[PDB]
Design a protein around this ligand. Structure first.
Ligand SMILES: [K+]
Ligand SMILES: [K+]
Ligand SMILES: [K+]
Ligand SMILES: [K+]
Ligand SMILES: [K+]
Ligand SMILES: [K+]
Lengths: 108, 125, 55, 74, 133, 161
RNA sequence: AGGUCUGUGAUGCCCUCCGCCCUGGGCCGCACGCGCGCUACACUGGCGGGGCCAGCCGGCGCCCGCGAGGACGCGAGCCCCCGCCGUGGCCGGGACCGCGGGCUGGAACGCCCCCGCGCACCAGGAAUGUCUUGUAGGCGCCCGCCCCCACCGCG
RNA sequence: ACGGAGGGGUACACCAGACGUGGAGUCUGCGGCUCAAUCUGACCAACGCGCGCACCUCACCAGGCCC
């Protein structure tokens, strides 16, 4: 199956096998202080989100369930560091692109 | 049909052995590629089709539960024999934790401090 | 010149605060003070064998 | 078909009640707890009382009278 | 070929150093504005600071002189909805001080608690000063 | 430092061998030396716990020793942690011989302190210091901080009798 | 003769008829000396994309909106992997301040988010505290008071 | 009861180590200052202690209804 090959190869070699403009002037979340740098990153994020959907064959994943999948910290704040979520518009839109039930969406 | 369990701190590993999978990711593809060796130690120091489901705690505990499960799941292969009696001996002469689960668990926190032994500083002035 | 010698028994803790341990090191029965943990059948490398431990 | 929910705080009474209903015939335990300074005012070593209270479900999806036991059917 | 100096906006720059960060040598600019200005101005962001051609500085100065006129969004510009012109300016220069000081001028005219705390050179933001500085 | 405290037989491949060693008394005598080392590596509150990263150093430093000397990466280790280990001490200060178990122990700590201080605020890697430091306390040269202070402790003990 | 009549229909004895309520403010004011703590002072690190694991028990789909945050409905961080910066108060450190956008609320002076502004700080004198296994320490999560809000305390 | 009296014990109190605190900014409490009021307690065993102060909680301040 797809599981028999590693994910760090799948995401990259599938972004190499695949497109909004808000891609520009966007960070992946309120955690990350900078926007990403490798401008292939939207293909890479899309390949990651699909490699993460095809895992979940029966039940329905969701988009908040996906921003919560892509999270990191907030720092430079003098306080004990807390975990924050990512953006929602980006992942919802990537799901809509890759889409062309009871809740969310699913594979095939 | 063979049942086997494995434990580290709160990690529970379930093994169905029949005449190799860990969380659907095969042996040498389990995330900690450095500790992969630690996992694969019994297989090489000592196949069948085994299958594992493990959760709980953290990465290193997952490793020490799956490894110990596979050890028991091939320890129960032969029965009532001298191999049944000496395999466990080679496992002990590797480490006794390869059979018997490790019984350490965190000690609870007691008020007036951050952990189980650290108090807060005592200032007289 | 190192003078390796071997302990044949522990007499007891010498320092007021615990610390050092009187041992019977060796064709001789020189007695010496030792800082760290020492069992029987262990080895001490001696800078000199000229002096024996008080008491 | 019939639903039975039977609840009580004392493990002995609850176990008795399930034992004396089968004389005729996942919802695990959870606990109600508080911590609170021992003294009335705020003077002295900061010691704490830790109060605790477990109460049980017993589930009877049906196809003795004990005071302190609670029953609902729904 | 590279030079070791791009002396711009009355503030010296060093070069030999990455351009996206080196452009923060200009006051009023952040790494955010550097990143959203260069690749918009069709320049690679990180090769070296001595390899920035003249027409390329020109593409810069034109993306700098009008940010909302090339798609840089409202929320990423600086002097949003000013009290000089009612319009989302781009203070991107070293004439920031005129805005700041004339602001102090207006407050010292209108006599607000915040301006007076700034006059006494203290906290203005509901922050305790019990502590001994 | 002796053949009763340098473990080179009872040891799993990589250092990591979770279990128990400080529970007894002479238990850590059978603790593999290439693990006793990494165990020390995870020192300082800024590295309290990190075991895998400490492992990324021992095996890697073992990638400069053969690339400069040409001798098995471990034979230099045992001999180096044997070269250190102050022989005497100045405990009313009298000179007292040091325990065999203790020298194996103190000397391991000494090599670590060498890199720790000689890696901070340095573009050069921390593992780089462990590298030259461990190959410096091999033949025997002051360049190795360990070899040096060992000499210093003998000077005081011989003078503090 | 620690503390507590300011927690109570516990209360003796004195004094007030200082009872109840309505609006506005203060308890949060500040040269200054103390104590308990939080974030640091970097390369054993910071940044960008990806992988993935807890327990005290616990709701989340459709969307809009850079974000925070709206309208409508139904039942984990460390760490690892790959890259960048290159010993420079640098991309360490994030205080202080200048616009905007939001939430709570009869009411912001309360809290969030976006751009900009980048303080002090180079491991700390004389002194001083705590600890023996899943322990120190590092990482994060949850509950309490709570209109909003944890650097606190119980876990 | 106490002893710079003798004797016998013991604890992370010391030994061997580790992690800290005191030096910077910052949150919080205390003092002292100011104020119409900045309500008040407690000085090892007070001082993130009297369970999160816009209003209420409030005991304090400037005024104003009712019995
Ligand atoms: K108290
Ligand atoms: K160069
Ligand atoms: K009372
Ligand atoms: K009255
Ligand atoms: K207290
Ligand atoms: K009021």
């Amino acid at each position: 199956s797809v599981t028999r090959v590693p994910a760090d190869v799948f995401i990259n070699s599938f972004a190499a096998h695949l497109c909004p403009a808000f891609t520009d002037y966007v960070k992946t979340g309120v955690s990350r202080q900078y926007a990403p740098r490798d401008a292939d990153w939207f293909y890479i994020k899309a390949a990651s989100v699909i490699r993460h959907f095809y895992i979940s064959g029966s039940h329905s994943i969701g988009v908040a369930g996906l921003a919560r999948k892509y999270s990191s910290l907030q720092k430079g704040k003098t306080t004990p560091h807390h975990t924050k979520r990512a953006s929602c518009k980006v992942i919802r839109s990537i799901v809509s692109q890759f889409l062309g039930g009871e809740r969310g969406r699913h594979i095939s | 049909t063979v049942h086997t369990l494995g434990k580290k701190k709160n990690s529970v590993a379930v093994a169905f052995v029949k005449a190799i999978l860990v969380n659907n990711v095969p042996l040498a593809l389990v995330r900690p590629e450095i500790l992969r060796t630690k996992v694969s130690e019994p297989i090489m120091i000592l196949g069948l089709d085994m299958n594992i489901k493990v959760a709980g705690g953290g990465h290193v505990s997952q490793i020490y539960a799956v490894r110990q499960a596979i050890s028991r799941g091939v320890l129960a292969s032969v029965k009532d024999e001298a191999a049944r009696s000496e395999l466990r001996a080679k496992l002990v002469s590797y480490d006794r934790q390869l059979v018997v689960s490790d019984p350490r668990r965190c000690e609870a926190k007691k008020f007036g401090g951050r952990g189980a032994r650290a108090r807060r500083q005592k200032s007289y002035r | 010149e190192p003078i390796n010698a071997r302990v044949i028994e522990v007499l007891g803790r010498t320092s007021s605060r615990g610390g050092i341990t009187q041992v019977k090191v060796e064709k001789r029965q020189i007695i010496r003070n030792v800082i760290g943990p020492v069992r029987k059948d262990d080895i001490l490398v001696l800078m000199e064998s000229e002096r024996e431990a008080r008491r | 078909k019939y639903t039975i929910i039977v609840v009580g705080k004392d493990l002995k009474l609850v176990e008795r009640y399930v034992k004396s209903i089968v004389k005729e015939g996942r919802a695990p335990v959870r606990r109600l707890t508080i911590t609170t300074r021992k003294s009335p005012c705020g003077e002295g070593t900061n010691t704490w009382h830790r109060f605790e209270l477990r109460m049980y479900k017993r589930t009877f999806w049906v196809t003795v009278v004990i005071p302190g036991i609670q029953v609902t059917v729904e | 070929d590279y030079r070791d100096l791009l002396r711009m906006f009355n503030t010296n720059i060093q070069g030999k150093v990455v351009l996206e960060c080196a452009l923060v040598g200009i006051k009023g600019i952040g790494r955010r504005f550097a990143n959203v200005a260069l690749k918009k101005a069709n320049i690679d962001v990180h090769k070296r600071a001595g390899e920035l051609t003249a027409a390329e500085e020109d593409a810069l100065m034109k993306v700098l002189e009008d940010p909302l006129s090339h798609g840089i969004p409202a929320w990423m510009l600086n002097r949003n909805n000013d009290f000089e012109s009612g319009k989302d300016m781009h203070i991107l220069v070293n004439t920031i001080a005129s805005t700041h000081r004339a602001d102090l001028e207006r407050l010292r005219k209108t006599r607000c608690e915040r301006g007076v705390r700034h006059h006494h050179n203290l906290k203005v933001r509901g922050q305790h000063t019990k502590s001994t500085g | 430092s002796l053949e009763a405290y340098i473990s080179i037989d009872n040891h799993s491949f990589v250092p990591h061998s979770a279990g128990r060693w400080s529970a007894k008394r002479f238990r850590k005598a059978k603790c593999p030396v290439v693990e006793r080392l990494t165990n020390s590596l995870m020192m300082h509150g800024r590295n309290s716990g990190k075991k895998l990263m400490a492992m990324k150093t021992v095996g890697e430093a073992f990638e400069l020793i053969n690339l400069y000397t040409g001798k098995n990466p471990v034979q230099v280790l045992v001999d180096a942690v044997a070269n250190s280990g102050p022989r005497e001490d100045s405990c009313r200060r009298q000179s007292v011989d040091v325990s065999p178990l203790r020298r194996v122990n103190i000397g391991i700590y000494n090599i670590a302190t060498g890199a720790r201080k000689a890696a901070f605020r340095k573009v050069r890697p921390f593992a780089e210091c462990l590298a030259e430091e461990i190959m410096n306390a091999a033949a025997g040269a002051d360049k190795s901080y360990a070899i040096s202070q060992r000499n210093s402790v003998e000077r005081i003990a011989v003078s503090n009798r």
